[PDB]
Design a protein around this ligand. Structure first.
Ligand SMILES: CCCCCCCCCCC[C@@H](O)CC(=O)N[C@H]1[C@@H](OP(=O)(O)OP(=O)(O)OC[C@H]2O[C@@H](n3ccc(=O)[nH]c3=O)[C@H](O)[C@@H]2O)O[C@H](CO)[C@@H](O)[C@@H]1OC(=O)C[C@H](O)CCCCCCCCCCC
Ligand SMILES: CCCCCCCCCCC[C@@H](O)CC(=O)N[C@H]1[C@@H](OP(=O)(O)OP(=O)(O)OC[C@H]2O[C@@H](n3ccc(=O)[nH]c3=O)[C@H](O)[C@@H]2O)O[C@H](CO)[C@@H](O)[C@@H]1OC(=O)C[C@H](O)CCCCCCCCCCC
Lengths: 273, 273
């Protein structure tokens, strides 16, 4: 439970720790990922890291005084060819590019284990799970109706098997029919596709059918995330709700998520893994 | 090998038999599916069938003189509530709506077996497989490079497992990464999504990486189809080629498909099931 070194991806999380770093006074250090990091993190202690500057990040976290790092934010796999220069990233690079061939987890695997080599003992999940994780049972006031339990179990099953092939982690099931499965497009894009599907095979704004399920990605530090946008994007699609495994989903801004889900009439539910 | 009764879906196939029915002189009868059938099939012998007019289609094929029917064209599952009226379709309806809950094959299953009850012995595949099926090995002049064989085996594997869950039948793999998987959106929409993905994880117009694979849907009469549009839609996405199981893919307009694939530099290849 030592602290802190922040490897900045993109999106709210990296600010949702800066807001939280205003608490304990670590004082954190932000390794801003040059290509992803928000400028709301401009001139916090730390540096700007080209995602290839693998050895600069190491000397920087070391420099400041870091023994414990947290991976927050959205990151994409690079187009490797066009990568930035750093000679320390090479001793481990092939084992990345090679694991990159497996999937978006075998790559993530090597990178994080690579840190653990350098003496940095890390855990990005527990730092943020004890703040903003999905709890068991409903999150808002809406519960699932009987007419929604079968889609719940099935959406989840599909998400898990899609998830073990390293394809994606999200899937959408309406009345037993799988409407969509997430790959590289992202959850928002996937929900958008669903709303675009003919109404004959989906719910609508006054009779909601269907569930979005996100799940890992089997045994964590990178876990499937949802936020407010997910709610109304889920809503447009006609979905009745969203499910995840308890302690295996990140809910950014859980109160506005609660507010939004409730007004729209959508459950959000954490099932037991 | 008797003939003929044509259950008209939509798209070229139902005309690609009318063109072919100009041959043997059956003379065919077209049960135009009221909601899908092209008007290029207006006033050919036969009728106009509301997809729910299940008993009208039966009396009509019987009326004309049909003992052998062929299912050609694209069809969607209806929004059942808004269906058209026919009292003969009811004795079998629940077993449709019920099988509809499984997937877009358990439903297709019951419907076609339902015909086989009425004395109509059918086979829509062999009628069209002996004209326009995918042959083993390349179809055009382009072959796959070494750099494309691993995506070929993997795209196929994924298509098959996606296919056994009754999700979809198409998938797209580029350098080992699954870019996309088809569900209800359709192949064209799926290829469009891929072209929309960041270029960092896909091929491009001068260095083509990746494969689209379509496959059944395990043991046929309804088989995954491709045509010219598939070629240039595949092309925009940066794909290097398209693969299917020999005798388990329909190639509409195989010569224009050949012409198009070749100019664009894309292989099309039938592997052994
Ligand atoms: C050579 C370089 C090699 C680098 C390795 C490249 C590996 C490529 C694959 C890595 C793995 C990567 O695909 C996954 C990833 O980056 N994780 C992050 C990812 O979650 P996800 O489920 O993939 O998002 P999704 O968009 O599908 O649905 C969200 C919905 O919510 C909504 N949403 C989101 C944010 C928000 O503020 N509000 C909101 O409503 C939004 O509208 C959506 O409806 O977006 C979430 C939103 O922010 C983050 O919380 C999460 O963050 C995490 O879970 C942790 C994160 O994975 C750490 C970064 C990976 C490791 C980086 C270390 C390597 C750098 C080292 C350099 C020296
Ligand atoms: C209560 C009513 C219950 C009704 C049951 C509803 C079941 C719902 C699910 C049924 C199963 C249904 O999803 C599948 C289906 O309808 N099959 C048909 C379906 O193939 P698919 O692979 O699903 O197309 P896809 O769009 O994903 O990629 C294509 C690419 O090619 C390109 N393309 C296409 C056409 C063309 O002319 N040119 C071209 O370049 C195009 O740009 C694309 O890049 O589109 C192809 C393009 O036309 C047809 O060749 C095929 O046709 C078949 O294989 C046979 C067809 O499945 C027979 C119809 C099903 C049985 C109907 C009997 C029920 C009625 C009885 C009433 C009494």
């Amino acid at each position: 439970m030592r602290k802190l070194g922040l490897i900045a991806g993109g999106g709210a999380l990296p600010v949702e720790l800066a807001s939280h770093c205003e608490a304990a006074g670590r004082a954190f250090a932000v390794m801003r990922l040059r290509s992803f990091a928000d400028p709301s993190l401009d001139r916090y202690p730390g540096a700007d890291v080209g995602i290839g500057e693998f050895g600069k990040i190491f000397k920087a976290l070391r420099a400041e005084g870091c023994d414990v790092v947290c991976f927050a934010g959205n990151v994409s796999r690079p187009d490797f060819s066009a990568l930035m220069p750093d000679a320390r990233g090479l001793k481990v690079l092939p084992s990345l590019i090679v694991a990159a061939r497996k999937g978006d987890d075998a790559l993530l695997r090597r990178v994080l284990d690579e840190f653990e080599k350098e003496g940095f003992e890390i855990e990005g999940a527990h730092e943020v799970m004890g703040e903003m994780t999905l709890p068991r049972g409903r999150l808002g006031k809406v519960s699932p109706a009987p007419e929604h339990m079968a889609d719940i179990d099935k959406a989840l099953d599909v998400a898990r098997e899609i998830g073990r092939l390293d394809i994606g982690q999200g899937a959408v099931v309406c009345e037993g029919l799988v409407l969509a499965v997430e790959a590289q497009e992202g959850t928002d894009a996937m929900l958008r596709r669903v709303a675009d599907l003919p109404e004959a095979i989906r719910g609508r704004a006054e009779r909601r059918l269907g569930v979005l399920a996100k799940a890992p990605k089997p045994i964590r530090v990178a876990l499937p995330t949802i936020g407010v946008a997910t709610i109304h994007r889920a809503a447009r699609a006609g979905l009745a709700g969203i499910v995840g495994e308890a302690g295996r989903l990140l809910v950014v801004d859980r109160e506005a998520v609660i507010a939004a889900a409730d007004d729209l009439g959508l459950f959000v539910l954490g099932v037991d893994p």
